[PDB]
Design a protein around this ligand. Structure first.
Ligand code: HEM
Length: 123
């Protein structure tokens, strides 16, 4: 899988997931969501988040996605502030690696698109 070559190696890829994983638990603001959740699923969820940010989709079909995430919005009171916290954490991880600042802005723009936030937030 030479695709990982772009990342700069597979070792670095796992390093980001491992560190990022702890950031979620470290963040008390969203820890309640992960207070009781199977770590197995989290591995995929967190992995998808990083992958989605590096290359999200302008439009995604699937009411099911909104049905679940929206449920959190009304039941747990999830808002854009929560999303920003998770996304902000990702930016910090990139800084540690030393990725040029120019890319950090572009990377955030990928998910920054409100087109993705609406599906998740379902405002
Ligand atoms: C764009 C970002 C996100 C994507 C792409 C995404 C994607 C997914 C996907 C594919 C699932 C189904 C498989 C699974 O259980 O992980 C899922 C489930 C879930 N997501 Fe997300 N998610 C995102 C953001 C969030 C955020 C911000 C929260 C809340 C902080 C969240 C909370 C949940 C919960 C609680 C479930 C479990 C639902 C259940 O099966 O009972 N997700 N997410």
């Amino acid at each position: 899988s030479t695709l990982y070559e772009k990342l700069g190696g597979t070792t670095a890829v796992d390093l980001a997931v491992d560190k990022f994983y702890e950031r979620v638990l470290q963040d008390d603001r969203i820890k309640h969501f992960f207070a009781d959740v199977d770590m197995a699923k989290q591995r995929a969820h967190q992995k998808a988040f990083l992958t989605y940010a590096f290359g999200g989709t302008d439009k995604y079909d699937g009411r099911y996605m909104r049905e679940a995430h929206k449920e959190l919005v009304e039941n747990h009171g999830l808002n854009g502030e929560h999303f920003d916290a998770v996304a902000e954490d990702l930016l910090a991880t990139l800084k540690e690696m030393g990725v040029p600042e120019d890319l950090i802005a572009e990377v955030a723009a990928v998910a920054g698109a409100p087109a993705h936030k609406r599906d998740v937030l379902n405002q």
